[PDB]
Amino acid sequence: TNVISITDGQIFLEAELFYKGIRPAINVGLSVSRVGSAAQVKALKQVAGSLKLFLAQYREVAAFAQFGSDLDASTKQTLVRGERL
Amino acid sequence: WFRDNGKHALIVYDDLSKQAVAYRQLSLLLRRPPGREAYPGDVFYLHSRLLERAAKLSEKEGSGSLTALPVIETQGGDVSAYIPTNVISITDGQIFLEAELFYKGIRPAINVGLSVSRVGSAAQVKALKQVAGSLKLFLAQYREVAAFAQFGSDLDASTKQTLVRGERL
Amino acid sequence: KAQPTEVSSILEERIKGVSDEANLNETGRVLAVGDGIARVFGLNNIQAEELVEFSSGVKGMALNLEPGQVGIVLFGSDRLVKEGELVKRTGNIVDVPVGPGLLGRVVDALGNPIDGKGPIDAAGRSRAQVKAPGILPRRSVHEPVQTGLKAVDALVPIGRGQRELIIGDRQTGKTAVALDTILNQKRWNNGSDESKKLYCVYVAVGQKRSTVAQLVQTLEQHDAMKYSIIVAATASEAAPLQYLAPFTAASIGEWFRDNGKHALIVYDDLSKQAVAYRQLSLLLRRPPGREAYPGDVFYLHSRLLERAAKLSEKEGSGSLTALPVIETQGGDVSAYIPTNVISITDGQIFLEAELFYKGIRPAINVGLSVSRVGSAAQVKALKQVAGSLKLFLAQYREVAAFAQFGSDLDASTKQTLVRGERLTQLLKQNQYSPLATEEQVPLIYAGVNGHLDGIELSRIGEFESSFLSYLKSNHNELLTEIREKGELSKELLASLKSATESFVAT
Amino acid sequence: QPTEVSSILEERIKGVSDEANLNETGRVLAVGDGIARVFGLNNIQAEELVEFSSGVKGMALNLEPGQVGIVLFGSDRLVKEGE
Amino acid sequence: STPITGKVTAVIGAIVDVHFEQSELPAILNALEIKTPQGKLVLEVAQHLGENTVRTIAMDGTEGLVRGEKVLDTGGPISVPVGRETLGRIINVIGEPIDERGPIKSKLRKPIHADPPSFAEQSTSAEILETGIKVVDLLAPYARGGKIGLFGGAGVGKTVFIQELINNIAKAHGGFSVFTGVGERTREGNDLYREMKETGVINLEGESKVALVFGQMNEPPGARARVALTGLTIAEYFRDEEGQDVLLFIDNIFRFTQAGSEVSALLGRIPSAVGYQPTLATDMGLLQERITTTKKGSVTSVQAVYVPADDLTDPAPATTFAHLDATTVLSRGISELGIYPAVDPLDSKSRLLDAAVVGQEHYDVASKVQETLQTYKSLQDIIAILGMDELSEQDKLTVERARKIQRFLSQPFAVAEVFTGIPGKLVRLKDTVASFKAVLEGKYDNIPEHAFYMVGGIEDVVAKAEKLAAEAN
Amino acid sequence: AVVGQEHYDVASKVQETLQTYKSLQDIIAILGMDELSEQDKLTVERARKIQRFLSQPFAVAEVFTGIPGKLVRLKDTVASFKAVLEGKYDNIPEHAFYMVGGIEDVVAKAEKLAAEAN
Amino acid sequence: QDLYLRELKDTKLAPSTLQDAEGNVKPWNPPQKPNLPELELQGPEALKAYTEQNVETAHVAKESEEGESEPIEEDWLVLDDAEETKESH
Amino acid sequence: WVRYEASLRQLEQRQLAKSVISRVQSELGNPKFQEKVLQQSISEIEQLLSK
Amino acid sequence: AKSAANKLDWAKVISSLRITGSTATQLSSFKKRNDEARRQLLELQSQPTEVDFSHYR
């Protein structure tokens, strides 16, 4: 707690992600960085500005696909986009 | 000082639980040996002495009256707690106003099953009791019948009227 | 009683000799006392962990030989004791009056008889903390035994030196599981066979003395006190007594097993012993450890259990099999004392809260229960022929594990469920009804061979009794052989199949 | 009971009862388990590296009024009382 | 006389430390008395701490205790008057007449802290005891010198049943009765005391039958800890000083154990794993292990328990419910169902009914009564769900018999002289077991069940049936 | 580059499948195997088979399981697991996957179960 | 020892008065000889069956029940009943 | 009968102890403690001269 | 040899396809079995019909 209150942020590499095959295992939703893209080469920024929102949407559809059922077009597209990303 | 004059009154030991915590700190600093829940066991002693202060006097001394309004802090319904348990037992009752019913928007959200005022009848007003007799059964039945939430169509019609009565009350 | 007068004269003569040879001039004076612990000065040359005799009459152990003030706990009430009373050094490490004579006698902490039967002879008074046999003087569990109640016992045996453990809530009757286990020392011990002898010695660590009376009566009526020495430590008794009691039982176990005969032990509720060690530590001066309990809880528990073993023929091939009993709150398997002990004991039999009110007077969680020796040291009837029945016990337990809310995928799972559930409703060996090594395999064998499984599940509660009686008065030769021949052969399996046909018929 | 006892607690033990020439050198009264008490260093700067004569260095995080305690940054087998 | 001088040197909250002279220091637990302007402060010697200094936990609120106060050692446990003289009043755990109805001139004063009795001469083959409650006198395999508590409801007519049980047991068995309130509310105490003055089990002038030894919350935690033992010693004294078999009623085993935990915390012990301390068990083990049955009678106490949330996650309640033999399901509805006592023998389960343990006839009566009641309960939740028509011939006969058992189960209440005027009614084993067997044997099965309500034994049951069937038509 | 790229991929797929089973266990218990995807159902079935393939008969453990011990060859085991995830024996019996050697002993056990269980 | 010898004397001759001599006890008013030896000797039967336990009340075993040797009436009805039962065999 | 015998046997030891209390009170009441003091002195002298 | 005594009746029930419906023969079999059960109970549970006067007195 003290480090997370003093440090810059975290890449909270939860064990489930590394077990889920994603090596390296930055659990993007559980990640954080106070500095952010302002401390980044904008060449990354032009694509990361969409990458972050796509991962966020995938977080929004993770439960919906966890149910393992059908949905609307936006939901299925979001799930495919998030898994692909 | 009010009561022995024979009159009536109502004390409100508001949030006695925090007073107990203050006693716990006082004991710890005064180096009295710690015990269960780390408060000095004397917490119960002080609380009992402060709680048995008030009652209704007899005609022998003029019959003074005094009502207590102590409050506590249910730390997740801290039933196994020491201070909450002593506050409940010392009190002649436990109107355990759990948060959940308050969270449904209700400002005065007591719990139907939990509140049992032992000496309430001796203070009950009869006219109210006349109707509250059915209110108690309606509440108990609502609690007993709300179990079948997902099988309510097949539920007995009288049970449906009982649920309607519980909801209305 | 003129004999009481003679005893008084002899004891006072001994006291006169003691006074004449007091040899106590610089012996310690108790500086202060409390909570069954007495801080005493002097005693400048007291050997560590030696009983100290105190003027108020109650003695006690000397634990912490601190710089100067040697700390002696009081093994008795304090209302008698007081500061400044003389402290007399017994000069000996705490030793227990031990020997075969204690049979049927209930002895206090160090071995003071408490029933009121007078003296009991001694075959040695050894210290309460003996060093257990190491590697070479130890051996495997090559000789099996019977737990008496079927009690998932053919499933998970209890062999020579099998340090099994238990658990349960308050008033879980795990004590009764112990008592029934003891009663099996009547179908072998009550004969004349030392090789079959397992001279049990229960314990009573911190129980309501009324429960002690209940235990004594249940021992006498079923004629158990002929083979069980039940060392007692009352709840009203003082903390040092309860703490030292398990050590006394250890001493008795040494006195028996070390002689070379296969013996057994069953420590009482040891959670009270742990609470006593907590009192002894946290009350004298020792800082507390993990789980607010004293740090050496594991040390004490091991020094109790590790005493039990099964020595080799070098030491006489005797053994002191132990069944330490621990208690939790809420059936908590996950606790400091429970989990730590389950590391120490080699077998576990978990008693739940639901099943304790749900479906079985035994209510032993078959899946949860386990023993670190199933093959080696199991009832040769239950393995040599019914080893497939043991694997079937494990398989059916796994089967009933999945029987909560899954659908009916096929008929195989449903058939396994119905047959195993009839088996579970069967296997509970009724209280104080130890009768085993005669038709143990029969339940699983008939279930797979479809003899009992065809009966109604509820009706089995009498169908089993009828089948047993039929084996007794009709299959008397085959049943007696299964008792004695030591195995249920394929020919005996066929004869038992015939008897099973007869049981199914009538 | 006329009074209380002679005392309650203590801080120093050894019995020179004289002037203090241990302003640069120390006396290792208590030493063990990687933590060592030192008698001496009257006005040492807190958290100053300090060398034990046996051959192991140390930093002094503890400067309690009686004795100052210095961590023994090494295998403690070389240190000894009074070194 | 040698009054051992003291000095009040350290009052650490309730626990107090008094230093005395060498060789004069009282031993542990010896009662010490300091008589301040607020009467007498009683100290029980708590620990011997040495230095000729005695640390004590006063049995009263040590408020106003001054430094330099000299303490005298009364050389024994808590001093309290003894005999049947004080019996039937409010007696302060301090000893004096708390009844304010006059000092208890019980010239004999008996201690509090006592040695545990000889288990060797106790009742291993304990004697079955008749209570006067036929329902509990038939289906309950019982014993003498033990305990039983299922108080369940919080005195909803039970304190009325309490004084009645006191009167009946003091009458038939010729003994006393002890209802000790440890941490019982001064308001609750006022209600109970006025109720008993109205109930007759003890009267300001009339003959008393019950013992009111209450150590309330209104005193220090040590007082709550030791008042229960004061009551138990009073009961043992009156039992042994008249050979009178006295049943004892206890306020709450939870109350006493909690008070003992409080005091033990006060002493200086560390907290244990959960909510305990170094000496949890020995507290209640002090009294209850010394209340057993002797030849002069018995000591089979009763512990009043209101099942807190009806949850068995408190070790003391588990051991207490294990203490009782059979359970009397005192459901509130049953009180209105037709039984004023409402002691359900439905939960009268025990394995002590052996051919050589509980008597063949008594155990058979137990089996029949319990089976009839349980079968009625079981067939209710199925047939009544189906309808009243679901009564089979066996079911209709069993329901008629069971309702006969339930209606008959009540007895007139002796301490209910104000209720409806019914004269005192109970049974006895000779009438009880046989009459239960016969009424279950169809003897009056044809007679209507309304006769069974408000009907005691067969002694007046026939007279009541005749009265009902005669003077109405 | 330690035990083989194929071995690394086999372990990665196996761990992913088992993690999927654990992740979906909550919805499985709450709703049931039918309520989720047939892809998810297939992965769950394969994972259950794999977990039931995780145990093996050890030479000294024959006291408990009773079978003479089986020592699975590293390369053989890797190939067996790659196949089992790849469905080269996905129709073999689940109970014939526990306490056996490699996938060869698995198929032998499936045949034995075909003989006995039927 | 004098403290041992004197204790033995005062605890033996007085034990003589209590038990070894029929002098009862002067310090205690009621003698146990007029209390225990005969009346409390019925205490054993007070706990037992009084005048019935030592007596063991005479209860001769009776005869079992039979058909009163009645084949004139029971046999024919039994035969008809068994044949009627045989009608659904 | 056997139980009555066992209880009477216990009553015997209890009564013996009760009379032993009076016997002990006699020891202090009679100044045989004077006759005991010389015995104590002699016994202690022998004990100290033992070694 | 009480096995044979009920062996004939067990065989009869095995062949009572013409004897099924015995209204008052199964009751007799119950009486015979109850007699044997009470006999075995008297033999086992009750001690010797004697007195241990050798030492108990």
UniProtKB/Swiss-Prot annotation, chain G:
Compartment list: Mitochondrion; Mitochondrion inner membrane
Ranges of compositional bias, category Acidic residues: 65-89
Main subcellular location of this protein, as a coarse class: mitochondrion
Keywords for the protein's UniProt record, in alphabetical order: ATP synthesis, CF(0), Hydrogen ion transport, Ion transport, Membrane, Mitochondrion, Mitochondrion inner membrane, Transit peptide, Transport
GO biological process: cristae formation; mitochondrial proton-transporting ATP synthase complex assembly; proton motive force-driven ATP synthesis; proton transmembrane transport
Residue intervals passing through the bilayer: none
Region (Disordered): 54-89
GO terms under cellular component: mitochondrial inner membrane; mitochondrion; proton-transporting ATP synthase complex
Coiled coil spans: none
Function: Mitochondrial membrane ATP synthase (F(1)F(0) ATP synthase or Complex V) produces ATP from ADP in the presence of a proton gradient across the membrane which is generated by electron transport complexes of the respiratory chain. F-type ATPases consist of two structural domains, F(1) - containing the extramembraneous catalytic core and F(0) - containing the membrane proton channel, linked together by a central stalk and a peripheral stalk. During catalysis, ATP synthesis in the catalytic domain of F(1) is coupled via a rotary mechanism of the central stalk subunits to proton translocation.
Subunit structure comment from the entry: F-type ATPases have 2 components, CF(1) - the catalytic core - and CF(0) - the membrane proton channel. In yeast, the dimeric form of ATP synthase consists of 17 polypeptides: alpha, beta, gamma, delta, epsilon, 4 (B), 5 (OSCP), 6 (A), 8, 9 (C), d, E (Tim11), f, g, h, i/j and k.
Miscellaneous field: Present with 6140 molecules/cell in log phase SD medium.
Family: Belongs to the ATPase h subunit family.
Name the UniProt record assigns to this protein: ATP synthase subunit H, mitochondrial
Source organism: Saccharomyces cerevisiae (strain ATCC 204508 / S288c)
Upper classification of the organism: Eukaryota, Fungi, Dikarya, Ascomycota, Saccharomycotina
Swiss-Prot record, chain H:
Signal sequence coordinates: none
Taxonomic superkingdom: Eukaryota
Compartment(s): Mitochondrion; Mitochondrion inner membrane
Family: Belongs to the eukaryotic ATPase B chain family.
Other observations noted: Present with 12900 molecules/cell in log phase SD medium.
Subunit structure: F-type ATPases have 2 components, CF(1) - the catalytic core - and CF(0) - the membrane proton channel. In yeast, the dimeric form of ATP synthase consists of 17 polypeptides: alpha, beta, gamma, delta, epsilon, 4 (B), 5 (OSCP), 6 (A), 8, 9 (C), d, E (Tim11), f, g, h, i/j and k.
Function, in words: Mitochondrial membrane ATP synthase (F(1)F(0) ATP synthase or Complex V) produces ATP from ADP in the presence of a proton gradient across the membrane which is generated by electron transport complexes of the respiratory chain. F-type ATPases consist of two structural domains, F(1) - containing the extramembraneous catalytic core, and F(0) - containing the membrane proton channel, linked together by a central stalk and a peripheral stalk. During catalysis, ATP synthesis in the catalytic domain of F(1) is coupled via a rotary mechanism of the central stalk subunits to proton translocation.
Protein's recorded name: ATP synthase subunit 4, mitochondrial
Natural source organism: Saccharomyces cerevisiae (strain ATCC 204508 / S288c)
Residues of the full protein shown: 192 to 242 of 244
From Swiss-Prot, chain I:
Subcellular locations according to the entry: Mitochondrion; Mitochondrion inner membrane
Protein name: ATP synthase subunit d, mitochondrial
Job description of the protein: Mitochondrial membrane ATP synthase (F(1)F(0) ATP synthase or Complex V) produces ATP from ADP in the presence of a proton gradient across the membrane which is generated by electron transport complexes of the respiratory chain. F-type ATPases consist of two structural domains, F(1) - containing the extramembraneous catalytic core, and F(0) - containing the membrane proton channel, linked together by a central stalk and a peripheral stalk. During catalysis, ATP synthesis in the catalytic domain of F(1) is coupled via a rotary mechanism of the central stalk subunits to proton translocation.
Full-sequence portion shown in this chain: 4 to 60 of 174
Family: Belongs to the ATPase d subunit family.
Subunit structure: F-type ATPases have 2 components, CF(1) - the catalytic core - and CF(0) - the membrane proton channel. In yeast, the dimeric form of ATP synthase consists of 17 polypeptides: alpha, beta, gamma, delta, epsilon, 4 (B), 5 (OSCP), 6 (A), 8, 9 (C), d, E (Tim11), f, g, h, i/j and k.
Remarks, miscellaneous: Present with 6820 molecules/cell in log phase SD medium.
